[PDB]
């Protein structure tokens, strides 16, 4: 049985070779698992939320890495907590944030240009853009963006010790417990939505609201950052800068970057009951991992799956999952990726890797996939 997950040799090309639509793998600690690799079967498993549980608190729930063996919407509260958050992620709300996002993107590209050719785009642009956008989504005031960017970078850089990362988490938790006491006082940001819902229902504690805000930061930061960095590397390889600069094409270019990069490579479930997926017999308690990256390269819905093609038709990719746990932030993540890539390649059309692609350095198998650094000239 092959190991899952494996290290990406090239960080913007997922580890494939897995048989479809279902195959047997071994997790890091030897636990057997069904890996779901077909696109249709991916959707079926993610939609069948009673049979395929994401209850991380249940003892059968599979860990994909040692570091994650040792925040999240618990099952009884899930639909209520999700409905709370979704009111802060309307299409109108994201459209309203676009001007703020392009201001954040431009001020970080000012810093890229100030430093000059040789700059690491990860530390200066790809990591900071999505933490500062989450600042603006939450209502974190401009004066505190530097502190918040710095502590969220400590968690996500994947260069800090487990202790340095726990420290940074605690600082952001402290900061947000302070800030939320000032919210619901005329603002329309995510922290005001949460206060207004607590004030209206009286059944949510302020610590639970801080936990929900930290969940958004953790779900929305490294994922968006790593799909932005990998997007840039992939566009530079494909000579695709110019298409990303095109305001009519950047939406479709971003869908194709999401399909390719699938930075949340797999999501874990466990069977709560005996079932069958594509004829395969699944016992209650069995690990079931949905390989979103592999579902995204199923040659049925995505013929010529490995080619970069923004014009691609057919079914939606599952980079953001599907069904009742589908990415709440998907619309915000698209807007962010579109404005960041559009403004980067308009301002710096001659952008190029300052080292060979083979020297970018990938992240570890277990976590959000990505590069450690992205040095660039123009
Ligand atoms: C490129 C960016 C992103 C990727 C690849 C991504 C990926 C995912 C995936 C695969 C899921 C489904 C988890 C599962 O089924 O087990 C998910 C859920 C979620 N995402 Fe995202 N995401 C992105 C951006 C964001 C952003 C920007 C936010 C918030 C600001 C966010 C917040 C969440 C939340 C709260 C959930 C949980 C929803 C639930 O369980 O009901 N994500 N994301
Ligand atoms: Cl150090
Ligand atoms: Mg456990
Ligand atoms: Mg520099
Ligand atoms: Mg893929």
Numbering used by the authors: 11 to 80, 88 to 395
The article reads:
Using a combination of synthesis and in vitro assays we reveal that AbyV, a cytochrome P450 enzyme from the aby gene cluster, catalyses a key late‐stage epoxidation required for the installation of the characteristic ether‐bridged core of abyssomicin C. The X‐ray crystal structure of AbyV has been determined, which in combination with molecular dynamics simulations provides a structural framework for our functional data. Abyssomicin C is a spirotetronate antibiotic produced by the marine bacterium Micromonospora maris (originally Verrucosispora maris, reclassified in 2018). It is a potent inhibitor of bacterial folate metabolism, showing activity against a variety of clinically relevant bacterial pathogens including Mycobacterium tuberculosis and multi‐drug resistant strains of Staphylococcus aureus. In summary, here we report the first structural and functional characterisation of the enzyme AbyV and unambiguously establish its role in abyssomicin C biosynthesis. This cytochrome P450 is responsible for epoxidation of spirocycle 3, the penultimate step in the biosynthetic pathway and is key to installing the ether bridged core of abyssomicin C, a structural feature critical to its mechanism of action as a substrate mimetic of chorismate.
The crystal structure of AbyV reveals an asymmetric unit comprising two molecules of the polypeptide (Chains A and B), with Chain A accounting for residues 11–395 of the full‐length protein and Chain B residues 27–395. Electron density was not observed for residues 81–87 of Chain A and 73–94 of Chain B, consistent with the assignment of this region as the highly flexible BC loop. The overall fold of AbyV is typical of a cytochrome P450 with a large α‐helical domain (helices B–L) and a smaller β‐sheet region. Surprisingly, the region corresponding to helix “A” in other P450s forms a loop in AbyV, hence our assignment of the first helix of AbyV as “B”. Each molecule of AbyV contains a single heme group situated within a large solvent exposed active site pocket of ≈1600 Å3, as calculated using CASTp. The heme cofactor of AbyV is coordinated by the side chain of residue Cys344, with a single water molecule observed on the opposing face of the cofactor, 2.1 Å above the heme iron. Each of the two molecules of AbyV that comprise the AU contain a single molecule of PEG bound within the enzyme active site. Our crystal structure provides no evidence for the presence of atypical catalytic features in AbyV such as those reported in other P450 enzymes. To explore the likely enzyme‐substrate interactions of both atropisomers of spirocycle 3, we used molecular docking to obtain initial positions of 3 near the heme group in chain A of the AbyV crystal structure.
